[PDB]
Amino acid sequence: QISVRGLAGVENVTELKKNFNRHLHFTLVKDRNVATPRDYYFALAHTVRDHLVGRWIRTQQHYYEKDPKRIYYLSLEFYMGRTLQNTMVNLALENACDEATYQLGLDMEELEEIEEDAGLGNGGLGRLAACFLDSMATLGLAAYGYGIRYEFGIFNQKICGGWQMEEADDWLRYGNPWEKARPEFTLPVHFYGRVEHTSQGAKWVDTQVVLAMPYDTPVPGYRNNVVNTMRLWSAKAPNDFNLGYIQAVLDRNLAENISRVLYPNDNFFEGKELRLKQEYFVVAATLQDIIRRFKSSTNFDAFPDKVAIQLNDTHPSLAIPELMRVLVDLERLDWDKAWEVTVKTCAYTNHTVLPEALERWPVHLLETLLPRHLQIIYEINQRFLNRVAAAFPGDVDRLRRMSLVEEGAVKRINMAHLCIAGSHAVNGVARIHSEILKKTIFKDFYELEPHKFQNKTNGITPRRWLVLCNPGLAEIIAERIGEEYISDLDQLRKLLSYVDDEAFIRDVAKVKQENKLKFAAYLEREYKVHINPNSLFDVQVKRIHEYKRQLLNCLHVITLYNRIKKEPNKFVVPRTVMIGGKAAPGYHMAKMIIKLITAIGDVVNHDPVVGDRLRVIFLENYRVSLAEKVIPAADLSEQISTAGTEASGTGNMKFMLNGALTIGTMDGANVEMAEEAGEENFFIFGMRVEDVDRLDQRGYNAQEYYDRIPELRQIIEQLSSGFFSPKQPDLFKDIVNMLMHHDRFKVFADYEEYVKCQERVSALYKNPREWTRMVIRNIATSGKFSSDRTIAQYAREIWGVEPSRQRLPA
Amino acid sequence: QISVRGLAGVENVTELKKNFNRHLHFTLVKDRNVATPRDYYFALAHTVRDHLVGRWIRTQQHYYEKDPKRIYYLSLEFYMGRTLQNTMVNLALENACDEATYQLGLDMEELEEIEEDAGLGNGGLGRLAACFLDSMATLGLAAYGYGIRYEFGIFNQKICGGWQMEEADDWLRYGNPWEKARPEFTLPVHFYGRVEHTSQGAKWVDTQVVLAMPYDTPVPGYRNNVVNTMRLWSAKAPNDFNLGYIQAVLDRNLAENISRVLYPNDNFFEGKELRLKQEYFVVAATLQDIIRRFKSSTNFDAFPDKVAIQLNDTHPSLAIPELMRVLVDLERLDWDKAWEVTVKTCAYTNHTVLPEALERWPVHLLETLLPRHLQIIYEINQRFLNRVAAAFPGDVDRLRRMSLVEEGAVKRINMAHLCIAGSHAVNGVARIHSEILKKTIFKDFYELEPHKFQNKTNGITPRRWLVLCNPGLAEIIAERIGEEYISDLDQLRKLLSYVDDEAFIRDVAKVKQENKLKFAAYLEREYKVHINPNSLFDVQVKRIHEYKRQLLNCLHVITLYNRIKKEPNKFVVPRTVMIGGKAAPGYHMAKMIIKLITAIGDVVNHDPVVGDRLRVIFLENYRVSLAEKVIPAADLSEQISTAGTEASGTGNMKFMLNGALTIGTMDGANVEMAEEAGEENFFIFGMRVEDVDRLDQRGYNAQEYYDRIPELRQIIEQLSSGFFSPKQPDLFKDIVNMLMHHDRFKVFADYEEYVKCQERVSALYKNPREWTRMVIRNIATSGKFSSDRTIAQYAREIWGVEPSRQRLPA
Ligand SMILES: O=[N+]([O-])c1ccc(/C=N/NC(=S)N[C@@H]2O[C@H](CO)[C@@H](O)[C@H](O)[C@H]2O)cc1
Ligand SMILES: O=[N+]([O-])c1ccc(/C=N/NC(=S)N[C@@H]2O[C@H](CO)[C@@H](O)[C@H](O)[C@H]2O)cc1
Ligand SMILES: O=[N+]([O-])c1ccc(/C=N/NC(=S)N[C@@H]2O[C@H](CO)[C@@H](O)[C@H](O)[C@H]2O)cc1
């Protein structure tokens, strides 16, 4: 049907149809009479996956023959979403499969909806890893993602009585067609035990062993025939485990719990032993695999020439002392050489400055679980502090500030400090974030080793986040500038030549309208919720956090409602305000925010005076597959975190690429987005970082804002008095108390500017032609935010490897 | 190579080779450079399984169209062993696959060794179910085996320091190519809760729900294109289970533990809650599935015309009150009609008379776990006892004897009594066993309802137990009488015409010698144990139990050793005495018997005076795949249980079919084997049932035997004094004490006759020609013991269906 979706050749369609029928018969053991829609999905998945196999084998064979430097991306999170469409896109099979299924009497889009998200991540950090794997494959890098195969991913969110309920995400229930178990590469991981010192060095003994079984998932590049590997480890008990008899077998569950479930905290640290076990488990199994592959190329001098390890936050920080352990204890290298190799091998990416998100492991936990690693960490710390002492003689406070060991009630290891000491490069994820790292939380480290500190502004893959989720936009773009932009997103700049082109303006607006109609119908069918598709789609989707200020959005929503009630017969630009996102199950305030949103909807959506002019909808179960639907439908992207708190954001970039305008603070990547598009083409409001700092120095007094803004006072009084919870008048007391007395994120301080800026948004939306021209200006300058650019920078400036757009033979 | 293994057509071989290569590539994601022997096994398994699919679908479609009466065989055990060779045999693919793999440069026999046994059974009862499924398919019956998919089957046995160690049988680790998950037929099973009485009857409420997910395994008939189904249930938690958050997800293990592990007790009852849960789980899920299939044919009058349920022992006895529950509580049938349907539907097979093996569930367990079933059982008992009271007025002791409810310290439900009351047929598994049921333990029930009591002598499938494990014997037989005997084993009688045929005698003896050489080499390679292949192979393989009297075998072995030591330069017929079998992990005496056997070996096998004249080997990890190797190699089959204790035995029949002579008591099926072959062609010794009874009446005094048999006294003194355990002189005190003072199985009473009978065996073995002629007489009369005969009898006399040898179209 549409060009960017590839060719539907006679030969290809015929072949797909017969392979589809073969799988239905031989693989699913069904015929057309008993086959369910799920069977049809599986037959298609198997049919498509067959096309990956030859390329997957030949890519890995290529890397064996050429022996390039290998990149190991270590993450506890890979937020992959669905795989079927992505695979078809990258293999140019989409139109052929659409035709083949059509001729079999099936609707491919319906089949696509059956696939579970691989929800092995919480949010931005997890999805960043996924985008990165796609870009690394597209850029022909010999890259491997290593993580954990969680049996349960991020929980499915249900809204009951306006409250979040969690249910287990049993995503493997029907089997995963996109993985291959690799039991022959099963590796032992050690826990507990004790350290013995011999004549011939330290030895870690009396350990408990858990097996790490790998599962390989293919990562196809965009039409370059490259298929890289994501290897995820699953925990398995050894067969003599606990080996009255019955209980010993049942106790195997204890070992296997390691890979059972993803911890559902976004930007928050919980010092739980099971989490520590997961972190070591992925690190220990991965490093053995790396070394095995390296030996099958004795001399570890060349190790950093053949291996790069990227640490996605501090979660896999134990790679540093684990590499030291292997090199020193097992390979018998001297400390200084082992350390040189380690530093040259590892690089660390920081993803947050929020203090509650930083990993600080109690010493007593490491002592019990990983006694040898603790000793190695102490030694690293001693040698590191000796360097600090020589660089800054007499500066005793610097020594305690920089120590990997934090003194206090409970001694803790600062994992961030460990990562900086043991890495040749440390990067933040947006220019302002990286500057804040050098200026504030890692200032001491920057002063010691300035050369280590870099920026690598985040990006998103334009395969998933344009071609896949918004084929209509991808097509009208390709009609004008060709298809090359899909793997060279900077080419979108050519669209600036069409900003006055009446045909293009009409087409951009038409694609948006179609996306909105499609999403409005999705809402009715799957959720019985009715919306006006001619309204401005005002969307804030992201994890629920105080720093992300969903609460500020709520205050705007109530302001609009109160203004309508005040002057009912005055014209207002109609809005559909959509807010979605999961709250961490232990995060009370986030759960209260969700309840507030639904409570506001309950009042607003049933007020006859309001009509279809204002609707407030909570988007349930926000996840990658939902993002792919709502983002193309959005008009307005809410990116309203307090300046200095969102390290980068990536949702922001997704919206920019898909034709929504942005209202946001100068925070994270918003700054660079505004710089690329021009500040005139962005809705910027609120305190800058410096303004926040000034306010902190003076002391933030929320009462002052309450006293001086009558519209804000009204809202607080409505909240307190029970306007939004009539049968439970004090329901929102915690929220009011926080806003009034303990607001770390200064919701009130940005309120006036936010509302005024929102008025400017509504004014522009009244003029469809000028709204769309500004949209074109955003899409046209969104090129910098491709993860291909990001990965090319990692490759050149950190990993020391050149990307290649060259095809492997088919 | 050999005829019975089928044709190796040019077309077939070419096709197998390309499908093998296809699976290696697309299924295993390997090429020949990296492929391991396990990959090669899997490629072959997938290649062979492809041939089942069309027949499997068309068999089930056939049953839907024809709607025959369906047979449901309910068992907690299916001891299947390996599936690859069995499938090739039944599909006539063995020579084609052998040729295809040969041309690919692979040895098929080596690949076959890679497959794990499906070890979902303990011993005879579990393997009986497996033989039965094979026969039901071969006889064209619309039959389904229903059981539990245990994640862990019978433990792997390791011998360490002469002691049994258990390790988890993680048989699913590499995946099972012979199953298809059927998540669309997932069903809820209820536990706990409470009973509410309404105007509209009883209701079972507030239950905990566990999901039952079915996995289907094909059961091919012998060359008739019939493929039946074995459906095994796996336990799954519902997604809102326990739904702080992390623990709730980890707690899902509690629900799923139901299908985790097979209870490893052979002929012994342990009243554990988890076992009860397993029993109800299989019953509840199965009955819902049966009813669903029945409705997709309102009127339950026709239920018994369309459904037979066979209860394999009392393990699935809850089917009776579960059927009543569904019919009465859910379908709203009156009690009397529900009961009529239930009785006409269910039949019960008893597998033991040992009192410690009988299931007697504490009332307090049923009260908590299955409150509604307890009420139904009480009601069944009341109505049943009212019938007894009317039939035998005034006989109050009969009333308490026949009650389903046992009074005492803890009230218990006698599950055997439940099964008799609720079944239209009750059968024992060999003529003497069925007679003992009517005469002793179920005498009261027989007097009340004589028509219910039947015999169905056990059998074994000649596919696995001749063609598969002994192709050489199968071939020399087919050369003379054709191939028809494989599904009509009575035809073996034609071999009586060859008892004087010199060519046949030579061939029978040659096949045995080859089998012995092959097994002697298996022992050296896999276990570094060296044996004389010219010795008599004296084999006792079966679970370790006091009733099976491995101890009596031990006493014979020591007698032989002592006699050799006494007269070292006298000629004796050389023997290799092999004993193997697992002990239940909690059964102390059985574990001591294993230690004794290894301890005897340690002395005997290293005595220079003995030389190669006597060797004692403990066969480690006895299981179906090992049986297939050792049974064809055996000369002498030890079947030496105390008369009246082995209900049937089936190992006995396996040996008879494979050319071993039998030394045994007149117990279980041995009686019918001797009757078929002629008592002159059997080595019968020892007390009959009546002699045991006489001895019990008088009182068994072991001391009397010790006092009068000097050779027996010597052995006991050697055991006591530490002759067989020099560094632990009292190691075997428990064994001596048991033999001397508390021997329920009268080991000493059969000792003299046993030893004398063993002398007669040795005498015959000295004359190879006459040994072999007697062997031919055994093989020739082994036809009765085909499970095809057994199943044809069940079909005609219990299930009310006619077997059919007619082919379905290919
Ligand atoms: O994505 N690709 O390109 C891909 C992935 C896998 C294969 C081959 N796969 N081959 C096997 S046998 N896959 C198995 O399938 C089971 C579910 O059916 C899984 O539970 C199991 O973990 C997995 O190993 C081939 C291609
Ligand atoms: O379960 N635990 O214990 C856990 C889980 C996750 C975290 C941290 N999660 N951290 C995230 S998701 N960080 C995000 O990273 C994105 C990509 O750079 C940025 O765009 C974004 O600004 C930033 O907030 C911390 C602890
Ligand atoms: O024996 N036959 O005839 C047979 C059995 C199965 C199939 C088709 N099978 N098709 C699938 S997708 N099999 C899956 O495979 C996984 C391991 O790879 C298992 O873990 C999983 O339980 C199983 O359902 C086809 C034929």
Ligand SMILES: O=[N+]([O-])c1ccc(/C=N/NC(=S)N[C@@H]2O[C@H](CO)[C@@H](O)[C@H](O)[C@H]2O)cc1
């Ligand atoms: O784990 N639990 O709780 C358990 C397991 C098994 C049993 C009983 N297992 N019972 C057996 S294996 N019975 C056997 O049946 C064979 C077939 O008829 C006969 O040939 C043989 O004579 C007879 O002993 C009892 C309890």
